[PDB]
Amino acid sequence: PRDAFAAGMAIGGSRVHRMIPYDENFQILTLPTTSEGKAKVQVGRGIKINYIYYWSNSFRDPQIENTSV
DNA sequence: CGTTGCGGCAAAGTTATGGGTAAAGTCACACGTAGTCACCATAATGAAATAAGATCACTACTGGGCAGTACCAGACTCGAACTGATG
C-alpha cells in the first residue's frame, strides 16, 4: 500500500491547495455533540457532559443560569 | 373495446402505551425540632359552721309523814297479911 500510495502521489502531484493547518480552529471544527445538543447551566458548577461538569466564567451571567445552552 | 369512476384487499403509515437503559438533573449533608400555655372537672383537705343537744339557774305547784300525845282496860307478879297442920 505504501508503494502504491507513493506512485499515485507522484502521478497526481501534491495538490497543495488542499493543505489544512492542524491548528486549534480545525480541532474545534471537528468536535462532536451530545445527543440532546444542549445543557443546563447550574449555579457555580457548569454544564454536564458525560457526568463531568465543565465550567466557564461566562456562566456567571445572571440571565444564563439554568438556561439551555 | 377502450376509458373512467368506484370499491375490496392488504401492506404501509401514523398515534398511542407500557417496558428498558444510560445520562442529565436534583437536592441535603452542612448542631438542632418538639415545646408551651389554656382549659374545666373531680378528690381532698382544712376551716367555718351547724342545729341540735346539755346543763345551770330560777319559779311555782302540790304530795304528804314523824316525833310525840293519850286512853282503856287485860293480865302477870308480889307485899302484906290470914289461916290451918304439925312436931
UniProtKB/TrEMBL annotation:
Domain of life of the native organism: Bacteria
Q: Specify the protein name.
A: Integrase
Entire-sequence positions represented here: 692 to 760 of 898
